């Protein structure tokens, strides 16, 4: 199985710990998230991981940022994805078993590494158990957003914002 993983600069160290664990467990990893700790933007990596899963390059995805909210939301805003923001084992298992979530989000700065490892393992070990009830929920979720061909598989999608950033448009 192939797991795509991504992150922003706040949790690169936690991502490394999970990447190591996944490989020890026999999983093939596609690391998309940022590779160092230089200030960057979570949507970039959330989108890359989302597309790996949606396009079939990876079976599932894991995304992390400080709280996990930003990157998991970015991952959710993509075709074919159901991203579950889970800082606990219980909801992560529910997300996989009931909502067949294919992207797991975790807050690497709010959850300790031992618990992150537990959440990931529980999410991966869980299996989607289809029922007429959850299939209806999933279908509704899959039909909320309106597909945008300009975003789908477009690597230059955020070039506009990145330029403005390089031009100091987003100063404090």
């Amino acid at each position: 199985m192939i797991i795509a993983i991504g992150n922003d600069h706040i949790v690169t160290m936690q991502k490394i710990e999970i990447s190591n664990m996944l490989k020890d467990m026999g999983y093939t990893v596609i690391d998309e998230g940022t590779y160092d700790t230089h200030r960057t933007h979570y949507p970039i990596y959330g989108k890359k991981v989302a597309e790996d899963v949606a396009d079939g390059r990876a079976d599932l995805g894991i995304v992390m940022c400080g709280t996990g909210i930003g990157i998991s939301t970015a991952a959710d805003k993509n075709e074919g994805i159901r991203a579950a923001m889970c800082d606990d084992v219980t909801s992560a298992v529910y997300a996989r078993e009931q909502l067949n979530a294919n992207v797991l989000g975790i807050g690497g700065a709010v959850v300790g590494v031992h618990l992150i490892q537990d959440i990931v393992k529980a999410y991966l070990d869980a299996t989607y158990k289809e029922t007429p009830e959850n299939k209806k929920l999933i279908d509704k979720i899959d039909n909320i957003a309106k597909p945008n061909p300009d975003q789908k598989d477009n690597p230059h999608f955020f070039d506009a914002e990145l330029e403005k950033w390089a031009e100091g448009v987003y100063h404090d």
Binding site: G66, T67, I69, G70, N78, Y94, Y170, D172
Partner: protein, 142 residues
């Protein structure tokens, strides 16, 4: 300040408790689910619709696990929903993400903790500045 709230059958009980809490604390509440919604998709979308179509910038969604309401509402263009289970994200998601709503899972988070989470969320404003690039990126997505 105004607060938009909603819940499915699983989060209804806590929603009612929080509603009374907020009202007893000078908060103006807009309950979009006087009766429990069919499910978390209906409740989360109802809260999202009322929010994006109002002058309020804070909302609370209640369901069993939180994950569902966020997963569904985040599919709406321009919406940003944060599942919250602890007290750091409660304020950080507002400060950095300008979270338009937080989702609380009643089967995950106890009531006393929920109130602290809610208060921290309501008492925190969006910092803007450099964080706007990330919000601009999210709003651009489906």
């Amino acid at each position: 300040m105004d607060v938009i709230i909603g819940a499915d059958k699983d989060g209804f009980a806590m929603k009612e408790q929080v509603k009374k809490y907020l009202e007893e604390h000078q908060y103006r509440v807009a309950d979009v689910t006087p009766e429990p919604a069919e499910d978390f998709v209906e409740s989360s979308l109802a809260v999202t619709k009322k929010l994006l179509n109002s002058d309020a910038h804070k909302a609370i969604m209640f369901d069993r696990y939180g994950v569902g309401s966020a997963m569904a509402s985040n599919k709406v263009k321009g919406m940003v929903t944060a599942v919250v289970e602890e007290e750091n994200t409660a304020h950080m998601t507002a400060e950095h993400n300008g979270a338009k709503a937080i989702a609380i899972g009643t089967g995950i988070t106890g009531y006393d903790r929920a109130l602290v989470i809610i208060q921290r969320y309501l008492d925190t404003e969006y910092a803007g500045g450099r964080h706007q690039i990330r919000l601009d990126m999210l709003e651009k997505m489906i």
